[PDB]
């Protein structure tokens, strides 16, 4: 059985208990904390690509009002984010299981851009999600995993200074 776990969940949970925020810029900003995934139960000899996307956790716009995040009253349907291919992809199961799969080079943007960067909507709440795609083999297979612990609101600047402080303390 394929097992997927979050590395450094301890630290993600500190961010989550304050409501996590991730900066988006026109050129695109790397994530802190970085999503790192523990994977076991792959076929060491089979070929796989690791994909990352962001699910809109709800259909609302959020605003930091008097020291607290509060949703708008006018939901709109969100639509899927684009997919980021882990740059090690494609690769052997052995490669992926030898150390945590680290998405350190994904950049989050607010503007439709050349390539690589993933465009999110500012002030929407997102749940990171990976897909492990068995490729090259006869039977293509996908396994998906969500990381509730890694939820964040996309922001053009930090609103909760408690988040600013945690980001600096641990980077
Ligand atoms: O690992 C995969 C893959 C397998 C299944 C879905 O994607 N690929 C896709 C295409 N590739 C590219 O062209 C580079 C990105 C520009 C990178 C390798």
Swiss-Prot record:
<feature type="DNA-binding region" description="T-box">
    <location>
        <begin position="11"/>
        <end position="171"/>
    </location>
</feature>
<comment type="function">
    <text>Involved in the transcriptional regulation of genes required for mesoderm formation and differentiation. Binds to a palindromic T site 5'-TTCACACCTAGGTGTGAA-3' DNA sequence and activates gene transcription when bound to such a site.</text>
</comment>
<comment type="subunit">
    <text>Monomer.</text>
</comment>
<protein>
    <recommendedName>
        <fullName>T-box transcription factor T</fullName>
    </recommendedName>
</protein>
């Amino acid at each position: 059985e394929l097992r997927v776990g979050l590395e450094e969940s301890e630290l993600w949970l500190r961010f989550k208990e304050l409501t996590n925020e991730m900066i988006v810029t026109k050129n695109g900003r790397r994530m802190f904390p970085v999503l790192k995934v523990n994977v076991s139960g792959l076929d060491p000899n089979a070929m796989y690509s690791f994909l990352l996307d962001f699910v809109a956790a709800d259909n609302h716009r959020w605003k930091y009002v008097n020291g607290e995040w509060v949703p708008g009253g006018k939901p709109e349907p969100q639509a899927p984010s684009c997919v980021y291919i882990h740059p090690d992809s494609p690769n052997f199961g052995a490669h992926w299981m030898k150390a945590p799969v680290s998405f350190s080079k994904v950049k989050l943007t607010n503007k439709l851009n050349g390539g690589g960067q993933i465009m999110l909507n500012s002030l929407h709440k997102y749940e990171p999600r990976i897909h492990i795609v068995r490729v090259g083999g006869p039977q293509r297979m996908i396994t998906s995993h969500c990381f509730p612990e890694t939820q964040f609101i996309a922001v053009t600047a930090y609103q909760n200074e408690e988040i600013t402080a945690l980001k600096i303390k641990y980077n």
